[PDB]
């Protein structure tokens, strides 16, 4: 009855989605081949697969996913991978020409002739669902096609469904480590699109994950493959509460009314714990008190922005496993007592907790070791003001002498758009610093 | 699937092309007979990128090979691997160029260019979505330097949307190859910044000095120099033809490599470069590759890349490897030598990866260079042009076929403009 729809566009997205499905695939007991190994009959009074899967009539399941990109290499890559027989053959909407890191090429000239196809596909899929809870969107903002299709699809989505919520997981460029050079330009235009159409978004800058992988996982030569599963796990914990029994349930609806003080301040950061390999795990405590304490460690924050330079607004942390509920109050009481974590004056309580019962499941062959307590803490705080501050500075300096400007104007975008976009951040940065003043 | 076509003219352009297909043929498993004999099944999923289909199961490469004299082309297909080229794709006149632009552009060049335009259009429209053009020609020679520009101007007008690259061999001051090189060479360079999109020079001077200080072979032949260049192109289109993690098509480089409209000259080089004697004893690891890529001498351009600062650059790392070290090494290099990189454009080094290394190696890198030092050759080319034109030497034949003094002043006029307009960004401070 209650279902969610997945949206993925962008090499950062298409692949991350390529991972987030395996974690779900293994948990619910459906093998990659597409056929459940029976032995799960006897009136089956549990539709545990509805929250992500849909019945095909006898046997297999077709996941609710739409794959989009303007290049064939990636999309068709999954068509002949180990997951060839799972995704719908025609549901992998694939373009024909690369975006070439020109946002204008992705929002006014080429994207139009295929976006109609995308909105068409979302129409048929949604009708089957009866209790659509919302939308999940993973996109790469520091890229050409990523921002373009994401911003364009977001725009058309809001004009057809309305109050339906939408959660966005963006991947902005890291402070000092990044690939694209024109990335500060194309990303800046993105904030204008997603500032007034997406309720909730989580910063997941790349640079932080490397530190988390190296600092704890004790792996010095990671690849993009291992980065994803850490991101994928967050998805596994976030959406679990819908599809598992719990003593204190948490629904997606309790984010658009539980963790955003105002319609404007709607950016928050994430984190994960524990992060232990398969060798060093057993020789630690991993108790309720310990797991929470590592949650607020600054260096472990998934966003390269020390939370210690600001206050906190409201954080919703979801527990899955066998955490004793009275232990939950044990951690929160101590944390408030400490001094290095400070909260704004006007918010007395800023934590809303939940308890699941299904333990986290570890993908075979990975790095994360099997555990029995874990937590996914999310925080929207004034600290994130730095990330906007840093990106803007990289922007205005290079825009001073119209570097790379020609590639954008010559494609149709108005030259005055950059004037407003920077005006967008200016207001947002101004808005943030005002809320932090004590009353 | 974003196919492209190759047009090369002149024997110099012809020579480079001959090696390129063979090297490209091997990577995609094309034998001199042309019957597919690949091992993995990844060698055909993009065979259309550089090859069509035919009845009987033989792949006919899509190339335009043509020159103003028959002797050179009679040899290019004369040796092995030449049978792949389809006879219909060859067009050749019977006059000769004689190291003068005039004959091969207006009198003889015009009288035969019509046929070439017919051949190119047939194939070009054949593809499903044209992805770009890549032309190998010589600016210091007769047929290449002169014919190539005229064809480049003609094609670009008809297809204002696609991209275009260029591989030219500007002549070296130390060693000479023709006395009329300055005249025709300079007059040709002015005709690229207006039509073509991307330019990446190659210097025979770097070819010789590279062979003897890194490779250490006493007798090197023209076979050796061509192989290095053939690899240079082979890495540019690597990502476009194989799977990977962060694909970057031909266009993607342009938006990241060219900051301003009149600043689209690049310099390329190949790494790793190691001799036979040192074949094994070095550790093929990420740190080794990154150091030799930016080395002073490893570059293939006569200019010294330490006499100024870089505007932008990108790397196409090839072959399976970790990602973390790739970013960190790029981050470290941009720091320890900040003075060699322009200040007002942050994060001025690109990254790119592919999942298939070249056959015969475990790690490979192809660097692209847009350096302020590129102006050094232009001073060498331009300065010589001044003195030679002072005494109207060798001029009266240039004026022998309708070619007049109006553009000679104009053509050289832009070259000085390009050089000066190129240097003011070096001292520009935000």
């Amino acid at each position: 009855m209650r279902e969610v729809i997945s949206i993925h566009v962008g090499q950062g997205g298409i692949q991350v989605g390529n991972a987030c499905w395996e974690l779900f695939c293994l948990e619910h007991g459906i093998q990659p081949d597409g056929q459940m190994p029976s032995d799960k009959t006897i009136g089956g009074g549990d539709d545990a697969f509805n929250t992500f899967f849909s019945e095909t009539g006898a046997g297999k399941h077709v996941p609710r996913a739409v794959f989009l990109d303007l290049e064939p290499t990636v999309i068709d890559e999954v068509r002949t991978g180990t997951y060839r027989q799972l995704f719908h053959p025609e549901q992998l909407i694939s373009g024909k020409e690369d975006a070439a890191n020109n946002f204008a090429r992705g929002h006014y000239t080429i994207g139009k002739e295929i976006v109609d196809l995308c909105l068409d596909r979302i129409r048929k899929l949604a009708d089957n669902c009866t209790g659509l809870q919302g939308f999940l969107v993973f996109n790469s903002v520091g890229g050409g096609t990523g921002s373009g299709l994401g911003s364009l699809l977001l725009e058309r989505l809001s004009v057809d469904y309305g109050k339906k919520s939408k959660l966005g997981f963006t991947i902005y460029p890291s402070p000092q480590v990044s690939t694209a050079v024109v990335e500060p330009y194309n990303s800046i235009l993105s904030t204008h699109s997603l500032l007034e159409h997406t309720d909730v978004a989580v910063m997941l800058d790349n640079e932080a994950i490397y530190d988390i992988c190296r600092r704890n996982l004790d792996i010095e030569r990671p690849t993009y493959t291992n980065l994803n599963r850490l991101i994928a796990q967050v998805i596994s914990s976030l959406t679990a509460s819908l599809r598992f029994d719990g003593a204190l349930n948490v629904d997606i609806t309790e984010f658009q009314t539980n963790l955003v003080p105002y319609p404007r301040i709607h950016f928050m950061l994430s984190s994960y714990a524990p992060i232990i390999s398969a060798e060093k795990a057993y020789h630690e405590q991993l108790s309720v008190a310990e797991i929470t304490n590592s949650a607020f460690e600054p260096a472990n924050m998934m966003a390269k922005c020390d939370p210690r330079h600001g206050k906190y607004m409201a954080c919703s942390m979801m527990y899955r496993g066998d955490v004793v509920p009275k232990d939950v109050n044990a951690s929160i009481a101590t944390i408030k007592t400490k001094r290095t974590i400070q909260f704004v004056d006007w918010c007395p309580t800023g934590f809303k907790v939940g308890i699941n019962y299904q333990p986290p499941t570890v993908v075979p062959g990975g790095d994360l070791a099997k555990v029995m307590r874990a937590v996914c803490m999310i925080s929207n705080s004034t600290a994130i003001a730095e990330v906007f501050s840093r990106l803007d500075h990289k922007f205005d300096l290079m825009y001073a002498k119209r570097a790379f400007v020609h590639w954008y104007v010559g494609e149709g975008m108005e030259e005055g758009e950059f004037s407003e976009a920077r005006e967008d951040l200016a207001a947002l940065e101004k808005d943030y610093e005002e809320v932090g003043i004590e009353t | 699937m974003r196919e492209i076509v190759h047009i090369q003219g002149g024997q110099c352009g012809n020579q480079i092309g001959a090696k390129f297909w063979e090297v490209i043929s091997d990577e995609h498993g094309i034998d001199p007979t042309g019957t597919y004999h690949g091992d993995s099944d990844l060698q055909l999923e993009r065979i259309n990128v550089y090859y069509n289909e035919a009845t009987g199961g033989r792949y006919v490469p899509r190339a335009i090979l043509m020159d103003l004299e028959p002797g050179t082309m009679d040899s290019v297909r004369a040796g092995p691997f030449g049978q792949l080229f389809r006879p219909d794709n060859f067009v050749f006149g019977q006059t000769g160029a004689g190291n003068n632009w005039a004959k091969g552009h207006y009198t003889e060049g015009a009288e035969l260019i019509d046929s070439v335009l017919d051949v190119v259009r047939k194939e070009a429209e054949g593809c499903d979505c044209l992805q770009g053009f890549q032309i190998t020609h010589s600016l210091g020679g007769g047929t290449g330097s002169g014919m190539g520009t005229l064809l480049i101007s003609k094609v670009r007008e008809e297809y204002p949307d696609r991209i275009m690259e260029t591989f030219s061999v500007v002549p070296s001051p130390k060693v000479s190859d023709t006395v009329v090189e300055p005249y025709n060479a300079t007059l040709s360079v002015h005709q690229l910044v207006e039509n073509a999109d991307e330019c990446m020079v190659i210097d025979n001077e770097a070819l010789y000095d590279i062979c003897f200080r890194t490779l250490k072979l006493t007798t090197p032949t023209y076979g050796d120099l061509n192989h290095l260049v053939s690899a240079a192109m082979s890495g540019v289109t690597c990502c476009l033809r194989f799977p990977g993690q962060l694909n970057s098509d031909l266009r993607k480089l342009a938006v990241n490599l060219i900051p301003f409209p009149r600043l689209h000259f690049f310099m390329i080089g190949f790494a790793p470069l190691t001799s036979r004697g040192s074949q094994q004893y070095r550790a093929l690891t990420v740190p080794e590759l990154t150091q030799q890529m930016f080395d002073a001498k490893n570059m293939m351009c006569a200019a010294d890349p330490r006499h100024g600062r870089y505007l932008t650059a990108s790397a196409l790392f090839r072959g399976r490897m970790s990602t973390k070290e790739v970013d960190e090494q790029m981050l470290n290099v941009q720091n320890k030598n900040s003075s060699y990189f322009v200040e007002w454009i942050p994060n001025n080094i690109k990254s790119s990866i592919c999942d298939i290394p070249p056959k015969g190696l475990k790690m490979a890198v192809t660097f692209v260079g847009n350096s302020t030092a590129i102006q050094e050759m232009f001073k060498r080319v331009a300065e010589q042009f001044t003195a030679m034109f002072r005494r109207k030497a060798f001029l009266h034949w240039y004026t022998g076929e309708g070619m007049d003094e109006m553009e000679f002043t104009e053509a050289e006029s832009n070259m000085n403009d390009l050089v000066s307009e190129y240097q003011q960004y070096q001292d520009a401070t935000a």
Partner: peptide, 29 residues
């Protein structure tokens, strides 16, 4: 025929003056 002067088309430069104005005004407020 030489064109390299860069001491100053003028319409754009004037706009840049206006562009900075708003950001200062937002900064001032």
């Amino acid at each position: 025929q030489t064109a390299n002067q860069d001491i100053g088309p003028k319409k754009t430069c004037n706009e840049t003056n206006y562009a900075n104005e708003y950001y200062n005004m937002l900064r001032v407020s």
